[PDB]
Amino acid sequence: SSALRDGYRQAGVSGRVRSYLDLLAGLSDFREHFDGSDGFSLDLVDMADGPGEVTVICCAGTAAISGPHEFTRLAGALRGIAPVRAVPQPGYEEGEPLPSSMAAVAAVQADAVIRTQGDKPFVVAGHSAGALMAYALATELLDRGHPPRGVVLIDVYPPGHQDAMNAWLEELTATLFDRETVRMDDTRLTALGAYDRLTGQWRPRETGLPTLLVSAGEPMGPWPDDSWKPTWPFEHDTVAVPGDHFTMVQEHADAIARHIDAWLGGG
Amino acid sequence: SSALRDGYRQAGVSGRVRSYLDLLAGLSDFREHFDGSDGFSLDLVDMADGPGEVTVICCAGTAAISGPHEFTRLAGALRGIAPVRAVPQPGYEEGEPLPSSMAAVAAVQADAVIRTQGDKPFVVAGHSAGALMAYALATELLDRGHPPRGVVLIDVYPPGHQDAMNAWLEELTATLFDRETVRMDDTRLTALGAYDRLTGQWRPRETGLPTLLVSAGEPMGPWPDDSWKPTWPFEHDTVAVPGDHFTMVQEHADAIARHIDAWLGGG
């Protein structure tokens, strides 16, 4: 077993999550971090080859349970409509190094797709806390010399806005600890507490491309009035979905796949 | 194939070990604890019975590779002279919780000492940080109706007195990584930080028990003037034993045996 998986759940039961995070990032100095000068390489995932003239891409967030083991859910719902590429995160499997700073990592997966694609249109579709990174990737892609086609976000909570909700959900992530398709050993945790320091210094920029949210449904509890729901500081158009945070996409992947079919046909 | 193994290694090549400990104790605060008002025990590791009048109780260490397993060497040395009742430090092997302070660990280990003993005299002993634990066990027994005949502080390094010396050793241990007797498991490295803050703000008390400090012969390397080796405030006879801070026990057990007898012969 392990030693950290123990404190993970003993924190959520009482209420001392914040103090735990200040501990984690403390160990993020003792490794072999890379930069745009040495050498690295990854190998894409083999998934679907379905029909379509516009393919879609996707990725994962930070919440431990992330991985290329759970998106096979939406894979079946989207088949017939369009293809789906699988871009894995650099680290979740024996034999890998860690980043150096926020605007450094992006010079890696940039070159990889500029070799395999060719001349096909695409779009993005992330989830969870990761809905921040999915936005950041589209920025460097815009002026390098190859603009996207349109993003579709799903539940988010960016910095410089709501100081309450955020850390309030992480407290729940430790209490709601039902099993996942993969075991939680001594590697999938040190990465979670690592991006915490990163996501606290970023602040969005103003761009001009078509956005689309897909909000949730029934609240976790007997919550008061208007004290939730995402609200980005820019401008966009929205569409809902029936469900809740922690699961949604799993047992509700057919729904969203239809909410996107109506979008791509106009804008 | 853990992760907390290399993280402890790469920390020695750079030169930062202090801030690495502030966290080890942060993680342990979450594990289940024992302070005196809860069930928990520890079977004294049976070493070798035999002749004698004043058995040597040798408490376990506080390092990563510590435990009553190391005292196997000294156990064979004391065959005929005096037996060894090596007290196991909790938290290191799978399943055992961690204490609150020093008066939480030395207490639980005190119970086992009186139980198996009885009207038979004994002399506690340890090694460096483990000696801080050994003394604490011997002092707690002082006014508790069972003051041991004495102690043998082998290369003990008292905190608050040796700032640069004791800390430079931890920085050396990391670069001394080379095949251990018992695999450096995850639950051992966490217990390190636990005991670090315990023995950290722990200032020993005075007693009328004879102490026999055992220092080293050759330094850990090139040393200018007299500023190495273990020290102590109270009155105690001191005697040296060859090998540096790491091989004065693992590769030099017998040399110490003849030293404690000449001491027990007096009073």
Side-chain angles (χ1 to χ4, degrees):
Chain A
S1 54
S2 54
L4 282 61
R5 180 194 172 229
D6 187 73
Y8 188 80
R9 203 171 68 143
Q10 185 70 9
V13 288
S14 120
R16 53 175 163 192
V17 184
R18 174 73 80 182
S19 290
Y20 205 5
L21 305 178
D22 175 91
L23 220 282
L24 293 196
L27 304 169
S28 194
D29 266 280
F30 322 94
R31 285 292 298 237
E32 192 180 52
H33 295 193
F34 67 96
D35 62 86
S37 188
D38 209 336
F40 171 52
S41 51
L42 53 171
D43 280 89
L44 296 171
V45 205
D46 187 286
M47 274 301 271
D49 66 303
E53 287 185 62
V54 182
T55 313
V56 175
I57 310 197
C58 304
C59 288
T62 71
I65 61 180
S66 301
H69 56 57
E70 55 172 10
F71 259 90
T72 182
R73 295 295 309 233
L74 181 50
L78 286 173
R79 295 194 310 205
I81 313 169
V84 171
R85 309 299 268 185
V87 172
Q89 294 285 232
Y92 289 68
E93 180 182 291
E94 165 243 305
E96 305 298 317
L98 285 180
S100 204
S101 74
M102 199 72 184
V105 54
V108 187
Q109 297 182 193
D111 198 87
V113 185
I114 311 174
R115 205 189 74 209
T116 257
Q117 194 55 356
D119 50 273
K120 192 70 70 273
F122 38 87
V123 305
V124 197
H127 178 69
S128 200
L132 282 156
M133 302 297 258
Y135 184 69
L137 194 58
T139 297
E140 195 73 34
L141 253 294
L142 183 70
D143 82 286
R144 158 129 196 72
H146 267 130
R149 292 296 180 80
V151 304
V152 176
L153 298 152
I154 328 185
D155 292 84
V156 77
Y157 277 99
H161 228 334
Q162 265 35 86
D163 286 294
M165 294 301 279
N166 173 223
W168 187 81
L169 279 176
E170 186 54 55
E171 298 174 28
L172 203 286
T173 294
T175 73
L176 206 150
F177 194 60
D178 336 290
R179 249 282 221 153
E180 32 274 323
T181 104
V182 156
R183 319 199 299 185
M184 305 175 107
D185 40 268
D186 61 281
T187 289
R188 307 186 190 255
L189 266 178
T190 50
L192 173 57
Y195 280 31
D196 178 89
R197 166 56 102 157
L198 296 165
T199 58
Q201 306 281 260
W202 190 69
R203 293 293 202 99
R205 214 85 181 171
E206 302 198 13
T207 190
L209 299 176
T211 27
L212 181 68
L213 298 183
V214 203
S215 64
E218 187 175 295
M220 191 53 78
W223 202 234
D225 26 284
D226 295 323
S227 290
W228 62 298
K229 180 182 187 175
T231 166
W232 204 272
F234 307 150
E235 180 190 289
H236 60 257
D237 300 280
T238 63
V239 290
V241 155
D244 62 293
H245 191 325
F246 299 81
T247 321
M248 53 180 286
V249 165
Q250 276 283 143
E251 297 183 71
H252 284 122
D254 211 339
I256 304 183
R258 176 196 61 152
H259 266 103
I260 64 106
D261 183 77
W263 194 62
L264 289 172
Chain B
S1 320
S2 48
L4 220 60
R5 184 181 191 243
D6 201 283
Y8 191 47
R9 167 112 105 80
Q10 192 69 32
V13 307
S14 60
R16 34 175 111 86
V17 197
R18 175 38 65 158
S19 269
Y20 176 91
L21 299 177
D22 196 83
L23 300 340
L24 312 189
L27 289 168
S28 72
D29 199 11
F30 288 68
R31 292 274 306 291
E32 182 167 90
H33 290 137
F34 54 82
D35 75 268
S37 296
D38 212 80
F40 181 64
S41 51
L42 65 190
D43 189 312
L44 296 178
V45 182
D46 173 50
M47 296 315 259
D49 76 278
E53 299 198 89
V54 183
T55 181
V56 183
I57 275 58
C58 300
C59 297
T62 303
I65 63 287
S66 299
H69 59 83
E70 62 191 309
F71 292 103
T72 288
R73 289 290 187 251
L74 178 57
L78 290 177
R79 281 204 287 189
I81 305 78
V84 176
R85 301 296 292 213
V87 186
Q89 296 290 139
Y92 300 109
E93 189 177 285
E94 188 193 326
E96 298 185 270
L98 319 171
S100 184
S101 57
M102 279 302 264
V105 50
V108 188
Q109 300 195 110
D111 302 300
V113 181
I114 300 184
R115 189 187 71 215
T116 57
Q117 212 63 83
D119 64 280
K120 191 63 158 290
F122 70 103
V123 284
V124 187
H127 173 74
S128 199
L132 300 172
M133 304 305 289
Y135 189 84
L137 185 67
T139 298
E140 223 66 272
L141 272 278
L142 168 64
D143 63 83
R144 219 182 88 81
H146 287 71
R149 300 301 189 171
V151 288
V152 180
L153 295 175
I154 305 176
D155 231 89
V156 59
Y157 269 73
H161 183 41
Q162 294 189 272
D163 257 53
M165 274 299 303
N166 192 43
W168 181 92
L169 288 174
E170 197 76 30
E171 288 176 39
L172 206 288
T173 301
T175 73
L176 193 96
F177 231 101
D178 172 44
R179 244 290 188 131
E180 48 297 289
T181 81
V182 180
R183 274 268 293 278
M184 207 169 294
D185 283 307
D186 51 277
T187 48
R188 295 184 160 257
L189 299 155
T190 57
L192 175 71
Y195 277 105
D196 176 75
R197 207 171 62 106
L198 305 184
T199 69
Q201 52 178 47
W202 174 74
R203 320 296 162 74
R205 212 113 67 166
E206 162 259 300
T207 181
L209 302 177
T211 294
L212 177 70
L213 211 185
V214 189
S215 68
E218 198 182 347
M220 192 68 70
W223 236 269
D225 302 285
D226 295 289
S227 34
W228 54 286
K229 89 211 173 179
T231 41
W232 208 247
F234 317 118
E235 184 202 63
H236 64 307
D237 284 1
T238 182
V239 286
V241 166
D244 55 93
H245 190 81
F246 297 125
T247 46
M248 72 168 288
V249 177
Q250 263 289 92
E251 280 195 45
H252 285 105
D254 284 272
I256 309 173
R258 182 199 55 119
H259 280 135
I260 108 287
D261 188 273
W263 175 55
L264 296 179

